[PDB]
Enzyme design. Structure first.
Site, PDB file in Angstrom:
ATOM      1  CB  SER A  12     -10.108  11.434  -8.169  1.00  0.00           C
ATOM      2  OG  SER A  12     -10.756  12.814  -8.128  1.00  0.00           O
ATOM      3  CG  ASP A  39     -17.903  13.050  -8.685  1.00  0.00           C
ATOM      4  OD1 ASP A  39     -17.184  14.049  -8.650  1.00  0.00           O
ATOM      5  OD2 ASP A  39     -17.370  12.013  -8.477  1.00  0.00           O
ATOM      6  CG  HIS A  73     -15.368  13.379  -6.311  1.00  0.00           C
ATOM      7  ND1 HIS A  73     -14.843  12.631  -7.430  1.00  0.00           N
ATOM      8  CD2 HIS A  73     -13.841  13.212  -5.785  1.00  0.00           C
ATOM      9  CE1 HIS A  73     -13.605  12.356  -7.703  1.00  0.00           C
ATOM     10  NE2 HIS A  73     -12.921  12.709  -6.537  1.00  0.00           N
TER      11      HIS A  73
END
Ligand SMILES: CCCCCCCCO[C@@H]1O[C@H](CO)[C@@H](O)[C@H](O)[C@H]1O
Ligand SMILES: *[P@](=O)(CCCCCCCCCCC)OCCCC
Ligand SMILES: *[C@@H]1O[C@H](CO)[C@@H](O)[C@H](O)[C@H]1NC(C)=O
Ligand SMILES: *[C@@H]1O[C@H](CO)[C@@H](O)[C@H](O)[C@H]1NC(C)=O
Ligand SMILES: *[C@@H]1O[C@H](CO)[C@@H](O)[C@H](O)[C@H]1NC(C)=O
Ligand SMILES: *[C@@H]1O[C@H](CO)[C@@H](O)[C@H](O)[C@H]1NC(C)=O
Length: 377
Positions: free
Chosen positions: A153, A324, A353
């Site tokens: 991320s 995601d 995610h």
């Protein structure tokens, strides 16, 4: 009913090194000091329970977490399904970083955590100061020339920024392993979208100007008392899925108490505000301090500079999830079309995610491939 499905996992109250030694692995604490005064507590697992070869020459693997998370992200489960432990047992010297503001990087030399100036940062400063400082520290300690960078991320966001604006640092990254890469967020699918389109003014009126969603006592109550009980159980799991996407059967429900008692780990309101500008502009650029003068004082321009993924020449391997909602396929695809030295790309369709750090099948889906790839590097 809603009875406790399992007795509270010990990891729920342990800090980074407590969890590592809890699993029988060697733990080592260190702290980096950023050029701008922030003290980052970073952890290391020199060798694994299954591999102690080349002590002093073991290749370095540095794992960087993302927004509102911490280093525990990489050791949140079992030794056999947590990347950090796996890299250790695969023969690596594993280092886990922590970004300024989180549970273990919340101390500056010059300012008080309670000061406004203390939280006057975003991932820009994490890229510009946290990484260089941390990586430089690790390589000078280990004696290695380069290391393997794995980010998740925002963990990849700061990697894109640094490695594309810091030619010297970039040259010390063997391969960039990006899980759920995020350069832009103009096509995210999570409901929390809108909270990000609210005017900056209102955002600060709501949250403030300092810390943002850190770990509280109550977080522990819910963690041990709600995320452990039978049906109320779902409140925790679904709060996670609304943010990351759905892959209901990949999450170990018996460990939600561990996940939520460690996430979120806090960050600056500014950082989230910066991400907000990103959701609105849909671009990949530096923070807008809110005035031509302040940006002048920061970029010597009136508008924060744009980041160029085209200048991120570090060999990069990407893994993103079809489900995601943050590192959505659309934003990821735009990111892939720019990266100059893409050596690998694997889209795991069902992955959301959080799977990249907690998916029960992460080893087969991602980790083993990373071990394999790092092995032939
Ligand atoms: C991907 C790694 C985890 C990041 C932190 C997830 C925090 C999950 O926690 C949830 O956060 C939501 C948004 O703040 C809240 O609406 C929920 O009440 C809370 O339980
Ligand atoms: P990653 O570091 C995602 C970390 C998940 C934290 C959840 C925060 C919820 C706010 C998101 C609202 C869209 O990527 C950071 C990019 C987020 C914009
Ligand atoms: C983690 O816990 C151990 C033992 O209680 C302690 O020595 C260490 O300082 C703690 N680490 C941090 C950063 O709090
Ligand atoms: C990890 O260990 C657990 C516990 O026995 C097991 O159920 C799981 O299948 C294992 N996964 C991998 C990838 O080794
Ligand atoms: C899920 O977590 C529990 C509690 O830590 C553990 O006993 C179990 O082996 C885990 N299952 C998997 C698939 O990892
Ligand atoms: C991206 O490239 C443009 C081209 O001139 C440059 O102006 C900009 O500063 C670059 N981004 C950064 C911050 O390196």
């Amino acid at each position: 009913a809603f009875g406790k499905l399992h007795p509270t996992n010990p990891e729920v109250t342990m800090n980074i090194s407590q969890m590592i030694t809890y699993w029988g692995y060697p733990a080592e604490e260190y702290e980096v000091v950023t050029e701008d005064g922030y003290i980052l507590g970073i952890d290391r697992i020199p060798y694994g329970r299954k591999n102690s070869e080349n002590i002093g020459r073991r290749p370095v693997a540095f794992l960087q977490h993302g927004l509102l998370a911490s280093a525990t992200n990489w050791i949140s489960n079992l030794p056999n399904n947590s990347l950090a432990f796996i890299l250790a047992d695969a023969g690596y010297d594993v280092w886990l970083g922590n970004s300024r503001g989180n549970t273990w990087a919340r101390r500056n030399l010059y300012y008080s955590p309670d000061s406004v100036e203390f939280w006057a940062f975003s991932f820009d400063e994490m890229a510009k100061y946290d990484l260089p400082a941390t990586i430089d520290f690790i390589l000078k300690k280990t004696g290695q020339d380069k290391l393997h960078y794995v980010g998740h991320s925002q963990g990849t966001t700061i990697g894109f920024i640094a490695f594309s604006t810091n030619p010297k640092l970039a040259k010390r990254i063997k391969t960039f392993y990006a899980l759920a890469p995020v350069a832009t967020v103009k096509y995210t699918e999570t409901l929390i979208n809108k909270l990000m389109l609210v005017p900056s003014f209102l955002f600060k009126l709501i949250f403030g100007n300092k810390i943002f969603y850190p770990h509280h006592f109550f977080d522990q109550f819910l963690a041990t008392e709600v995320c452990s009980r039978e049906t109320v159980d779902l409140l925790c799991s679904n709060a996670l899925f609304i943010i990351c996407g759905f892959d209901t059967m990949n999450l170990n429900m018996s460990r939600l108490d561990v996940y939520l008692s460690h996430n979120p780990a806090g960050t600056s309101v500014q950082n989230v505000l910066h991400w907000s500008q990103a959701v609105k502009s849909g671009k990949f650029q530096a923070f807008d301090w809110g005035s031509p003068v302040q940006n002048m004082m920061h970029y010597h321009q009136s508008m924060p500079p744009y980041y160029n993924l085209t200048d991120m020449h570090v060999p990069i391997a990407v893994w993103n999830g079809g489900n995601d909602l943050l590192a959505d396929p659309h934003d990821v695809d735009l990111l892939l079309s720019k990266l100059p030295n893409l050596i690998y790309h694997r889209k795991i369709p069902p992955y959301n995610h959080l799977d990249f750090i907690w998916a029960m099948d992460a080893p087969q889906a991602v980790y083993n491939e990373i071990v394999s790839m790092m092995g032939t590097d």
